[PDB]
Scaffold this active site. Structure first.
Site, mmCIF file in Angstrom:
data_model
loop_
_atom_site.group_PDB
_atom_site.id
_atom_site.type_symbol
_atom_site.label_atom_id
_atom_site.label_comp_id
_atom_site.label_asym_id
_atom_site.label_seq_id
_atom_site.Cartn_x
_atom_site.Cartn_y
_atom_site.Cartn_z
ATOM 1 C CB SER A 22 16.403 9.379 16.790
ATOM 2 O OG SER A 22 17.462 8.589 17.286
ATOM 3 C CG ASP B 54 6.906 6.290 -0.293
ATOM 4 O OD1 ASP B 54 7.550 6.356 0.674
ATOM 5 O OD2 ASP B 54 6.702 7.243 -1.083
#
Ligand code: R9J
EC number: 3.4.23.22
Length: 330
Positions: A199, A35
């Site tokens: 992004s 994770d």
């Protein structure tokens, strides 16, 4: 040093990936869910409440000659999906793909929530976010990567998740045969303890690219791609019959549909998620309503580039003094 381990989907939908991890002496091999969105290495154990264990492989510290109780240390974690676990702490030797850390904090579960018990394929989690998120009290502990970093050839790990197939986690080196083109690196903020990045925009299918900053986290323990409601609505509007269902808990679409791709920006580069990666299958066995792999983050508080996005790329987690993320097509 380096390490290299294969990671394998737990089911036919790629709901999560498990990687074998050797703990203790002699080794006890447990299959952990790596994770990058959390920072605790915790395991099902001989201390886990018996009614909460259903098929998992357990760590038994009393059978490890290198295990030592970390006296007074406890841990307790609650995840973003509502699951949780807690217990006490041992230090022991932990190896991943040939890379060995001595003195790693291994958090032994006394209690796990029902979603852990109900998944027999996952024996625990290995956190790869920043150690500032580790929950051990009163002395916070380091992640496996943080403990290994100084010994690694380069202070990096890479995630190369497969679509309906195994992939690879590498530690300490970048496999230049594992991707196409070049790796585009982008800045990371560690202020929230995550691999948080921005992004540069998105496109739906063959549509024009929309330049827009989308802050989010690179999270290998999250299955889906969670983005702002505007972006998600624009995607599903291109799928006839798709709709957000409050009763199901997100966007669903007719199983007869062909899904468009989704592109996300990394700097001036572009990562394309094929439409098939966005299909998570019938909402219930035999249903003709299918669950979407791109969902709104509006109720989360953060955008999450989970497995749906990451499996479309070769991803570099660069843990240098100033961390960065790298993405390449593959
Ligand atoms: C068995 C199981 C149960 C829960 C999850 N979710 C985690 C990784 C805890 C999350 O951070 O949301 C994954 C697998």
């Amino acid at each position: 040093s380096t390490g290299s381990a294969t990671t394998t989907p737990i089911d036919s939908l790629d709901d999560a990936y498990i990687t074998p991890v050797q703990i203790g002496t002699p080794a006890q091999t447990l299959n952990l869910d790596f994770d990058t969105g959390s920072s605790d290495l915790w395991v099902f154990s001989s201390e886990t409440t018996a009614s909460e264990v259903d098929g998992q492989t357990i760590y038994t510290p009393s059978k490890s000659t290198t295990a030592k109780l970390l006296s007074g240390a406890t841990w307790s974690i609650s995840y973003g999906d509502g699951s949780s676990s807690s217990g006490d702490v041992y230090t022991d030797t932990v190896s991943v793909g040939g890379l060995t850390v001595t003195g790693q904090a291994v958090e032994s579960a006394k209690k796990v929530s029902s979603s852990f018990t109900e998944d027999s394929t996952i024996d625990g989690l290995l956190g790869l976010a920043f150690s500032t998120l580790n929950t051990v009290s009163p002395t916070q502990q380091k992640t496996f990567f943080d403990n290994a970093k100084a010994s690694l050839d380069s202070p990096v790990f890479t995630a190369d998740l497969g679509y309906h197939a195994p992939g690879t986690y590498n530690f300490g080196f970048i496999d230049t045969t594992a991707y196409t083109g070049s790796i585009t690196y982008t800045a990371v903020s560690t202020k929230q303890g995550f691999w948080e990045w921005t992004s540069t925009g998105y496109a739906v299918g063959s549509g024009t690219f929309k330049s827009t900053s989308i802050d989010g986290i690179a999270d290998t323990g999250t299955t889906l791609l969670y983005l702002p409601a505007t972006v998600v609505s624009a995607y599903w509007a291109q799928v006839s019959g798709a709709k957000s269902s409050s009763s199901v808990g997100g966007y669903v679409f007719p199983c007869s549909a062909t899904l468009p791709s989704f592109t996300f920006g990394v700097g001036s580069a572009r990562i394309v998620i094929p439409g098939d990666y966005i299909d998570f299958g019938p909402i219930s066995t035999g249903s003709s309503s299918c669950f979407g792999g791109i969902q709104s983050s509006a109720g989360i508080g953060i955008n999450i580039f989970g497995d749906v996005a990451l499996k479309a790329a070769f991803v570099v987690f660069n843990g240098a003094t100033t961390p960065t993320l790298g993405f390449a097509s593959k």
